[PDB]
Structure formats: C-alpha cells, structure tokens
C-alpha cells in the first residue's frame, strides 16, 4: 500500500537560526512575530506560505537591528529559519 513519511507535512518556522539568540522588544514584541503577523496580513491572500515566510526573513534581516547600551549586545542582526517538510504548496485563500 502507498505510504507517506510520519515526519512529512510539518513546517517549523523558527524565529532565528540554529545556535542564535532571538530578539524581542518590550513594547512591539519579538522581531519575528511582528514581521510574521505583518506579512500574513499583507500577503495571505496573495502569496504561497513559503513566499510569505521569505518576506518575513527579509523583513527581519533588513528592518531590525538591536540597540543596547552595552556594546556587547549592540547593533546585532537576526535571520529567521524556515524548516519545511511540507509536500505541497500552502495557500490560505483556497
């Protein structure tokens, strides 16, 4: 009989790359969730999910930089990490 892997059809949308800290702001929230929500609001009716998550990657990568009064933590950057075991395209407007 035909089977699929038990690990198939999972997507893990990580806020950050393996090994890395994940940045948050006290008033606006985390960089990743901000960008994810904003990109879903703008593109959930226009783009496939992977392409929405790619806009999130760019938004987080380009529009955010850490501010710290401690130079150790200042001017730091963040890339999210899309991990897809999906077998199909995902459109929210279907």
């Amino acid at each position: 009989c035909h089977k699929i892997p038990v690990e198939a059809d999972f997507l893990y949308a990580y806020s950050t790359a393996p090994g890395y800290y994940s940045w948050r702001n006290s008033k606006d929230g985390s960089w990743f969730i901000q960008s994810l929500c904003a990109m879903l609001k703008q593109y959930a009716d226009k783009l496939e999910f992977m392409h929405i998550l790619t806009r999130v990657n760019r938004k987080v990568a380009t529009e955010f930089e850490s501010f710290s009064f401690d130079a150790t933590f200042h001017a730091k950057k963040q890339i999210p990490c899309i991990v897809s075991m999906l077998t199909k395209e995902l459109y929210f407007y279907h």
Binding site: A8, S22, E89
Partner: protein, 141 residues
C-alpha cells in the same frame, strides 16, 4: 495535486503557548512584550479563520499534557494545524515556566502515524524562542 486541500469546514486550531513569567528556581527573566505577540497572533490567525486558543504561563508538564490532549482531538474537519510557541529556548528546546521541554517530544504527538486526523495535512510550528546565545554581528549591505 500541488496545493494542500484548504476547503475543509474549518481552517484548524491555532494553539498559542505564551510563557511570560518563570519560576525563580530557573533564574529566567520575565519576557516583556510577549503579550503583544500573543495578541498580535490571535488577531492575525482569527482573521485567517483559525480557532485560536491562547495558553499563558504553562509548566513543562502542562505543555506536554496540552499537546498530547490536542493531538488526541478529532481534527478530521480541519484543514491544518498551527502551534505557536513563545518562550525562552535553547537548541531543540522550549521552556516551560519550571524548566526545559524537548521540542521533538511536543511535535511527535502530531506525527503522521500518531495523529491520524491530521495525516496529509500541514502542521505548522511557529517557534519564537532562543536557539542559543550566539549573536549575529551582521555585515554592511
């Protein structure tokens, strides 16, 4: 076909675990701004027609129990499943209020063979949590 079937009667569950405050014994700081995330996520996913369920300040045991219970629900009328994790973290790890949970243990409940009403359906785990303490210094564009 090339696209997941998304015209089931329901879009699916959106489980949000929002851990802000942590036991003194852990030595973990309060996660200021996480409520802003949780509210933002509920608004966003409810507008996408997801059935949003917010859980605040869950212990490691509560997280596991919740996920086991949710995976044992009838998802047959649901197109997909979403789980959002907002907590402290380490590589492969999400924190309950009282200590670490293995992310693999959480997601295993939803394996194709263990959650049969979600077999063949997209299972989305959105993980807002540290994966270590490493900092990206960046590079000029």
């Amino acid at each position: 076909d090339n696209s997941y079937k998304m015209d089931y009667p329901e879009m699916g569950l959106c489980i949000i675990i929002n851990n802000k405050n942590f036991h003194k014994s852990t030595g973990m700081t309060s996660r200021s701004g996480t409520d802003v995330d949780a509210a933002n996520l509920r608004e966003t996913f409810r507008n996408l027609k997801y059935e949003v369920r917010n859980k605040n300040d869950l212990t490691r045991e509560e997280i596991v129990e919740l996920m086991r219970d949710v995976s044992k629900e009838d998802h047959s009328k649901r197109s997909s499943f979403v789980c959002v994790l907002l907590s402290h973290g380490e590589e492969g790890i999400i924190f309950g209020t009282n200590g670490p949970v293995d992310l693999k243990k959480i997601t295993n409940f939803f394996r194709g063979d263990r959650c049969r009403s979600l077999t063949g359906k997209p299972k989305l785990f959105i993980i807002q949590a540290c994966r270590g303490t490493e900092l990206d210094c960046g590079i000029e564009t």
